[PDB]
Structure 1
Amino acid sequence: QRIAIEPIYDPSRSVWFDPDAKKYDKSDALWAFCMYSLSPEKYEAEYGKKPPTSLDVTSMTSWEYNWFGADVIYIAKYYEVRKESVDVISYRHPITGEIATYDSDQVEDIEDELAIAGFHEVARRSVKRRRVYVSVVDGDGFLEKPRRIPGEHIPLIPVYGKRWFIDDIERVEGHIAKAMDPQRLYNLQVSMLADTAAQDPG
């Protein structure tokens, strides 16, 4: 097993968080979405034959843009955080030290050594923990049923240029938003001068 770091493409129209999270790093969030586009053939590869797909909708893109591709199929990943109750069933084995042992519920089922050198002793303490589940959904139903991922936090890491919290809404800014008006006014000035010059040469 391994931990991997992967990139996310088009974050502006792909990542959506709980509207109740206010911190920079979104620590206090309880769910999130991560959308990505897909081709009909790759949707046929996994997820089986299936109906002809029901993609998600945002009504965001093609806003001043040309469309030619019907290879849309938008799929999303869904992250949940739940409390749940898990039984710690410690094999606190007296020998070779081993005081205050772990034995979470998900250990014994996979770890079947037939209890070589552990003993069982106190194993009847139930504790509320915190786990994270992941799922794959579309506009119709579940492409992949929920399963728990190995951690405690939502594994999405946001990066901002400049971020502020103004009126119940988080606001960001890059490095070119402030220069739109002078640039697109300079362009108009040059374009208007060119043809006026070209109209009456001599």
Structure 2
Amino acid sequence: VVEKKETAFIYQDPVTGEPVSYFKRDIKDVIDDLADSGFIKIAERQIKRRRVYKSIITCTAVLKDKQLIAGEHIPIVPVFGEWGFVEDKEVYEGVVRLTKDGQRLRNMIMS
């Protein structure tokens, strides 16, 4: 995720009001089509936003470099159980860990 200030255009909606469109999203595709459709530019600002880039990599080379993907956030959602930091070291635990020692004993004795 890269957070940067990018250009945005303040047009005037032919129906009503004035809109804000990011310059990168209509950079070349329709940048001249707004004028034909009745949108005229009234202002240009610099607005800060985040962009997400994905790269496909292996241990020796980069296949895809900086493929821009949709969204302002990394699309992975994590879920944690008992989560914390001890000494700048993240630790997460469920319900099985603390029972491993006793159970391993119960298996041994029964064996």
RMSD over equivalenced CA pairs, Å: 2.0
C-alpha deviation, 1:139, in angstroms: 0.7
Higher relative contact order (CA 8 A, sep 6+): 2
| Distance in 1, Cα, partners of 2:50 & 2:67 | 14
For the residue of structure 1 that corresponds to 2:87, the secondary structure is coil
What is the deviation of 1:112? 5.9
Q: Residue 111 of structure 1 corresponds to which residue in structure 2?
A: 30
Offset at 1:118?
0.8
- 2:16 maps to 97
What is the SS of the residue equivalent to 2:98?
Answer: helix
Taking structure 2 as the reference length, the TM-score comes to: 0.80
CA contact (8 A) 2:82 2:92 kept: yes
Deviation string 1:141-165 (CA, Å, 9 cap, x unpaired) is 1111212222111221111121122
Q: Secondary structure of the equivalent of 1:130? A: strand
Partners of 1:90 and 1:104 within 8 A in 2: no
Q: What is the TM-score normalised by the length of structure 1?
A: 0.48
| Among candidates 113, 123, 129, match of residue 49 of structure 2 | 129
Contact 2:51 2:71 in 1 (8 A): yes
Corresponding residue to 2:61 among 136, 141, 146? 141
Identity %: 30
**Deviation string for 1:57-97 (max 9, x for gaps)?**
xxxxxxxxxxxxxxxxxxxxxxxx1133421122223x321
* Cα shift readout 1:103-153 (whole Å, capped 9, x = no counterpart): 21112523367321111232x323332211111111111111212222111
Helix, strand or coil: the match of 1:90? strand
Residue identity opposite 1:148 in structure 2:
L
Structure 2 stretches of 5 or more lacking a match? none
